[PDB]
Amino acid sequence: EGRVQHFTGYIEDGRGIFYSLPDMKQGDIIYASMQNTGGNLDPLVGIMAEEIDPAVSLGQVLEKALDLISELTAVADRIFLGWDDDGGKGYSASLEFTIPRDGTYHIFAGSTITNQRLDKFQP
């Protein structure tokens, strides 16, 4: 009947927290759901088997007054094997991922890059 875990955490600056999954199996289906419980955080949840650092070029995407959906889509799709953007529940802060091969994987729990204001667009 499925197996479930709970976690609570804090995204401090925008930069995310890593959770390690050892002994993942070929075929097994990972379900992840990330809900805001305080602050203005719009969640981003993702999966990767290799630890290469998202903060630096996500930092570089912020620097661009550039469109952006395409720029962020391209970066995300390249850095994560599967990913999803909080958008409350409208963007269904949640994914389903079937594990391609045996090994240790890591899920990323953090912030997306969004605009919050109507008075100016500064994401």
Residue numbers belonging to the annotated binding site for Ca(2+): 42-43, 85-86, 91
Interface with another protein by CB under 8 A: which range of 24-32, 75-83, 101-109, 113-121? 113-121
Q: Which of 4, 40, 52, 78 binds another protein (CB under 8 A)?
A: 40
3-state secondary structure of 56: helix
Contacts of residues 37-41 at CB distance under 8 Å and 24 or more positions apart, as own/partner, are 37/8, 39/11, 40/116, 41/11, 41/86, 41/111
Binding flag, residue 116, another protein (CB under 8 A): yes
Residue 96 CB, shortest distance to another protein, in Å, is 18
Tell which residue, 34, 43, 30, has the closest CA to residue 105: 30
Residue 16 CB, shortest distance to another protein, in Å, is 17
CA distance 104 to 91: 28
- Footprint on this chain of another protein (rule: CB under 8 A): 36, 38-42, 66-69, 87-88, 90-91, 114-121, 123
